[PDB]
Amino acid sequence: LAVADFGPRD
Amino acid sequence: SRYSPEFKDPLIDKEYYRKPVEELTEEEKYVRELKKTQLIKAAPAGKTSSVFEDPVISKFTNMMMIGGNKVLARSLMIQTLEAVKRKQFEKYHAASAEEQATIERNPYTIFHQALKNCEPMIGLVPILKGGRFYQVPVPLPDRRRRFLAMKWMITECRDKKHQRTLMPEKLSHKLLEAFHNQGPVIKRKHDLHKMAEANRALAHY
Amino acid sequence: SLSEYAFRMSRLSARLFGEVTRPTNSKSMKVVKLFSELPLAKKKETYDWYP
Amino acid sequence: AISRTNENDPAKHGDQHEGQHYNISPQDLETVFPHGLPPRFVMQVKTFSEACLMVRKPALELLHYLKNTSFAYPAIRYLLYGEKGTGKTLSLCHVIHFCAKQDWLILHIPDAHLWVKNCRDLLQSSYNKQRFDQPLEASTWLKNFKTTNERFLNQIKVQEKYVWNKRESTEKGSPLGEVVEQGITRVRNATDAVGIVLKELKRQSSLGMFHLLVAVDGINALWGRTTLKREDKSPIAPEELALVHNLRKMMKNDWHGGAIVSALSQTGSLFKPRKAYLPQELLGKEGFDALDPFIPILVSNYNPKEFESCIQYYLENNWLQHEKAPTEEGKKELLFLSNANPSLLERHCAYL
Amino acid sequence: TEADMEEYIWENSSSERNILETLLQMKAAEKNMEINKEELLGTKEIEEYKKSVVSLKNEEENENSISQYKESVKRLLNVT
Amino acid sequence: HYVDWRMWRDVKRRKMAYEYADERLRINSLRKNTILPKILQDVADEEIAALPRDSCPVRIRNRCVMTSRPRGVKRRWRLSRIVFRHLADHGQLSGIQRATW
Amino acid sequence: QGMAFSKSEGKRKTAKAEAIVYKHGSGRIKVNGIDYQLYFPITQDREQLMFPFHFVDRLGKHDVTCTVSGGGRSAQAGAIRLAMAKALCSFVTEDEVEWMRQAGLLTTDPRVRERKKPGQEGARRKFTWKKR
Ligand SMILES: Nc1ncnc2c1ncn2[C@@H]1O[C@H](COP(=O)(O)OP(=O)(O)OP(=O)(O)O)[C@@H](O)[C@H]1O
Ligand SMILES: Nc1nc2c(ncn2[C@@H]2O[C@H](COP(=O)(O)OP(=O)(O)O)[C@@H](O)[C@H]2O)c(=O)[nH]1
Ligand SMILES: [Mg+2]
Ligand SMILES: [Mg+2]
Ligand SMILES: [Mg+2]
């Protein structure tokens, strides 16, 4: 979960 | 299957065979003397020893194939690789000597990196506990991550939002977008992860 | 769509091989078929169907 | 630069330049080749930012004949033939460039198959009610013909009075450009304007005004079958088309002062099998009779020297991006799959 | 008619009519007045051209026949 | 002594159709061309329509010869599927066997 | 003329091929008298012809004249691949022949069309189980 890329947050 | 369980899959790798004997270990020596007694399946027509063979593109091609039409699926793939390369040569010639160093013109490198930027690390799978199905955010195996990056890319290009655009132009445009961490398919990856973070409290189900 | 030579050479072959010699449309050629075979009712499989 | 030559004048090319690529200036691409270049070759010019044509024995053989042309004898018909994708079109274009740079008047038909198929507006002609006009096909060619021969369209002057309508007419002595502009401006007169152009050039070339090159790619189209239909859904014959009826006359050796260089193409033909390439198989009986006597020039696959120079030209443009393409094992696979065929090699390299 | 024939005959054909018309224009260009048909069509070059066209018309077309036809046309048209 | 009344009617239809076959063939020939006058063909139409209804061969039905079943009949043996199988399954039909492949 | 050659046969689906591989050559392959790239316009069928010679590093070293009948374009290319590989084994070392065997180049593919069964739509597909 920490490694994963959640994208530019908004 | 028309192959008895005794039939082993063929190993198509020239290097594996030219490897000298001295480099071989006692375990690798046993496997080689064993296969001389085993039955081997006929090599499929898909894969060959050619130096230009790419198992990922061959797989992406099959996931685009409709009704066994490999000729058409293959034609679309090669048209996409040509369209990606031409878009990069046009971006390359129009750029400055400094920007030119950062511009990739190999469509195979773009294709692989575009998919790797879309592979989802974690997915939502309904694990059952207490008589109900809760979409638990579960780790994804390597096979599943690579498959999902392909299915999402092919699905996006088949979407009806694209009006009269041919597949080699749609797919090339999506690959170059994903190659730059941009696009709808990249958003699907990000949203899947964000949904998996909102259901972290449901990991106990 | 045939030359005079071909048209008259085909009409000569028809005379020798006992084919229809006059120009005959497809509808009228059924008369030839009707008399070239036995009627269904006259075939032994038909009138001797049952023991 | 092992695959390139510094000699960019097609008049000085010889056997020592076989297999080497010479550059066609952008100025000559706009003027000499507004049409006729293969569509995929045009893509290569945009991608490589340059037009380079390999010098091969078909064009060299043909350039040798044109340089020794006797302009007093009747025009000679040269027919390029060969298997699909062997370079017939680009051998013709190499010859068109030679004549274009020698101040010849160029009559280039880039594809004669386009005049016998897929015609939306097939109008009846007014000059002859038994023929059909093709305003879009004719106006398109006229625009390209004007571009190639714009410097000669004022010096050349008509030798008759041509009537377009009751009100409008082209009087004797008017520049031929006036005839070419009437067809472009008024598409209804485009098909007859083409017929007047072919009429004047054939007439004035035999008088010594200029040298004329007739270049027709897909010549087998003229004496084959069409897919155009009448309003009663009946098939139309090529002779009934005004564009085809008049182009058929340029292919007769009843004039002198130039040459007729044509190329066969099964690609885009009508009612011909995929593997048909020989002259009679593609031209038919009516076609072979219209051109006989003619000089057939064979175009074949790349020889070992030409194949390697072709690969080097791609590697010099960084077109082959696969890391294994420059290797000896990569080139042997590119040779087996294409079998040295220029078109198959260009298509295979296009995605590698 | 010619369409009914099953064997090509060079005599009184389009080939004979076209080649003879070509040789006359060439003689006129040289300003030579030897316009006799029997003399023009009696040379050995015409016999090779006749033998080549007949082969193309009555036998299977192939690269060797197209080359034999080519060399016969080059001699008649003085193309070297 | 036929299997049923329906087989007996077909027997009569086959007998009457055989008796009128030549007469019907000749009259139909007059109707099946564009050569003769319509006035003559119109009379031939009335003549063939005036023949007995059971002389018309389209009314003949291929019934099972042993059970009179009108459907499920195999023309080659003139038997219904049920009767054919009974004989086939007891090895009484020369050369016929169960098919596996 | 004294040129050494080997001959073999191959079968793929309903396609049957017979190939003559010459000991020495330039890489020419004739299929029913036609150039292989004219007979096989599909790039995948030509890759199958390349596979045996490429695997043993003999591209451009043998001439082949083969005849193939039956089956489709892919089955014909597969049958020729097997016929050429079997004949090519005469001109390679014993160790190379065992490498071709382990690569699946010398095994006749047993995968043939399955018969349709009665009472179902296809060889395996069943008719729709009607809504209850
Ligand atoms: N002389 C040449 N110089 C450079 N490229 C060439 C040459 N000849 C052939 N090619 C390559 O091969 C391709 C096919 O050539 P081209 O279209 O001229 O052949 P063709 O025989 O006229 O084809 P078709 O049978 O379809 O009419 C070109 O687009 C180009 O990539
Ligand atoms: N509009 C127009 N077209 C003309 C005229 N004269 C000739 N043409 C065109 O020029 C072509 C060639 O002329 P010509 O040799 O007289 O044609 P032909 O009479 O059909 O053999 C014709 O087919 C017409 O399309 C003219 O006075 N007006
Ligand atoms: Mg061409
Ligand atoms: Mg019935
Ligand atoms: Mg099915």
Task: Please write down the HEC assignment for all residues of B157-186.
Answer: HCCCCCCCCCHHHHHHHHHHHHHCCCCHHH
Give CA–CA dist C7/D334, Å, rounded: 57
Q: Please name which of D94, D218, D210, D93 lies closest in space to residue D149, comparing C-alpha atoms.
A: D210
User: Which residues 6+ apart lie within 8 Å of G78 measured at CB?
Assistant: B45, G10, G12, G13, G15, G48, G109
Q: Which two tokens stand for residue D324?
A: 């294994």
- Hey, are the CB atoms on G54 and B17 less than 8 Å from each other? no
List of residues 6+ apart from G109 with CB closer than 8 A: B42, G12, G13, G78, G82
Beta-bridged to residue G64, according to DSSP, are G21, G29
State the angle between helix axes of D57-67 and D88-100 in degrees (0 to 180), rounded to the nearest 10. Answer: 30
Give yes or no for E46 touching D (CB within 8 A).
no
Instruction: Spell out which residues of chain B touch residue A7, defining contact as CB-CB under 8 Å.
Output: 186-187, 189-191, 193-194
The closest alpha carbon to B154, from B45, B59, B88, belongs to B59
Inside any domain, residue F101? no
Distance from CA of B90 to the nearest CA of D (A): 7
C26 by DSSP, 3-state: which?
Answer: coil
Whole-angstrom Cα distance, residue G129 to residue B175?
42
Q: Using N-to-C axis directions, what is the helix angle for E44-58 and E14-29, rounded to 10°?
A: 150
Q: Which long-range contacts (CB under 8 A, 24 or more apart) does D146-154 make?
A: D146/D177, D146/D180, D146/D181, D146/D184, D147/D30, D147/D31, D147/D34, D148/D31, D148/D32, D148/D34, D148/D100, D148/D106, D148/D108, D149/D105, D149/D106, D150/D31, D150/D177, D152/D105, D152/D210, D153/D177, D153/D180
- Would F8 be classed as within a structural domain? yes
Residue F40 lies in a domain: yes
If you take atom 11 of ligand 2, which residue's CA is the nearest one?
A: D195
Protein residues with CB under 6 Å of any ligand 2 atom: D 127, 162-164, 192, 195-196, 199, 242, 246
Distance of CA D32 to the CA centre of its chain: 11
Residue D43: closest CA among D275, D308, D317: D317
3 state DSSP class of G9: strand
Instruction: Specify whether the CB–CB gap between D75 and D253 falls below 8 A.
Output: yes
**Which residue is it, tokens 């197209």?**
E66
Nearest CA to ligand 1 atom 7: D87
Of the candidates G126, G5, G124, G127, the one whose C-alpha atom is nearest the C-alpha of residue G65 is: G5
Is D284 in contact with D223 (CB distance < 8 Å)?
yes
Preceding peptide of D293 cis, ω within 30°: yes
On whether residue F100 sits in a domain, the answer given is no
Which of B35, B39, B45 lies at the smallest CB-CB distance from G78? Answer: B45
Q: Which helix (H) or strand (E) holds D53?
A: strand D51-54
Q: Nearest ligand to the C-alpha of residue D194?
A: 2
- Closest to B4 in 3D by CA, of D219, G110, C10, G58: G110
Domain membership flag for residue F99: no
Q: Of C46, C49, C43, nearest to F64 (Cα)?
A: C49
Type of residue found at G65: T
Tokens of C31: 């008369």
B170: amino acid identity, one letter: K
Q: If we measure between CA atoms, which residue out of D66, D74, D79 comes closest to residue D287?
A: D79
Place of tokens 């480099």: B23
Residues from chain F contacting residue C20 (CB–CB below 8 Å) = none
DSSP, collapsed to helix, strand or coil, labels residue D167 as coil
Q: In this structure, what token pair is assigned to residue D88?
A: 């017939």
Pairing of strands D21-24, D51-54: antiparallel
Our measurement of the distance from residue E77's CA atom to the centroid of its chain's CA atoms, rounded to an integer in Å, reads: 10
Q: Give residue F73's domain range.
A: 1-91
Distance CA E56, CA E60 (A): 7
Side-chain-facing half-sphere of G101: CA atoms under 13 Å: 15
- Classify the C-alpha dihedral B71-B75-B81-B82 as positive or negative: positive
- D47 sits in which H/E element: helix D39-48
Is D279 touching E (CB cutoff 8 A)?
yes
Would the CB atoms of B10 and G104 count as touching at under 8 Å? Answer: yes
Dist. CA D20–CA D55, nearest whole Å: 6
Q: Is residue F27 part of a domain?
A: yes
Does residue F97 sit within a domain?
A: no
Nearest-CB residue to B50 (from D49, D318, D333):
D333
Beta strands in chain G (DSSP E): 5-12, 15-22, 29-31, 34-35, 64-69
When CB atoms are compared, the residue of B52, B78, B82 closest to D333 is B52
Cα(G74)–Cα(G90) distance, integer angstroms: 26
Do D125 and D131 form a contact (C-beta atoms < 8 A)?
yes
Are B75 and B65 contacting, i.e. CB atoms less than 8 angstroms apart?
no
Strand partners, D22: D53
Q: Which 3 state secondary structure label does DSSP give D298?
A: strand
Among D196, D247, D248, the mutation site with the greatest number of ligand 2 atoms within 8 A of its Cβ is D196
Residue B83: name the closest of B168, B151, B8, B198 by CA. B168
Based on C-alpha coordinates, what's the Rg of chain G? 18
Do the Cβ atoms of D289 and D302 come closer than 8 Å? no
| Angle at CA of residue D308, ends D302 and D310, nearest 5° | 70
CA distance F9 to B150: 71
The total domain count for chain F is 1
Quick one: closest CA in A to B195, which residue? A6
Beta bridge partners, D215, equal D108, D261
Chain D window 225-264: which residues touch E at a Cβ cutoff of 8 Å?
253-254, 256
List residues bridging with D80 in a β-sheet.
D263, D297
Phi (first) and psi of residue D211, to 5 degrees: -90, 140
Q: How was this structure determined?
A: cryo-EM
**End-to-end C-alpha distance for chain F, whole angstroms:** 43
Which stretches within chain C are classed as H helix?
Answer: 4-16, 30-36, 44-47
CA B46 centroid distance within chain? 16
Instruction: State how far the Cα of D145 lies from the Cα of D34, in Å rounded to an integer.
Output: 9
Calpha distance B38→G85 (Å, rounded): 19
Structure tokens at G93: 């070392």
* Residue D329 parent element (H or E): helix D328-338
Q: Which residues lie below 8 Å from residue F86, measured CB to CB, with a gap of 6+?
A: none
Token couple for C4: 């005079």
The HSE-up count of residue B103 (CA atoms within 13 Å, CB side) is 18
Residue F9, domain member (yes or no)? yes
DSSP-based three-state secondary structure for B26: helix
Residue length of chain B:
205
CA of B2 to the centre of ligand 5 (A): 19
Q: If you ran DSSP here, which 8-state letter would residue D311 be given?
A: H
- DSSP single-letter state for residue D175: B
CA–CA dist D198, D244 (Å, integer): 12
- Subunits next to F (3 or more Cβ pairs <8 Å) are C
Q: How many CA atoms lie within 13 A of E29 on its CB side?
A: 20
Name the residue among B81, E27, G3, F17 with its Cα closest to residue D350.
Answer: B81
By C-alpha distance, which of D258, D256, D260 is closest to D248? D260
Distance CA D229, CA D223 (A): 17
Residue (of B140, B153, B146) closest to B188 by Cα position: B153
Compare all CA atoms of chain B with the CA of A3 and give the residue at the minimum distance.
B121
List the structure tokens of E52: 């080549």
DSSP state of D4: B
> What resolution does the deposited structure have, in angstroms?
2.9
The residue whose CB lies within 8 Å of the most ligand 2 atoms, and thus the one to mutate among D192, D202, D204, D248, is D192
Instruction: Write phi, then psi, for D74 (nearest 5 degrees).
Output: -60, 155
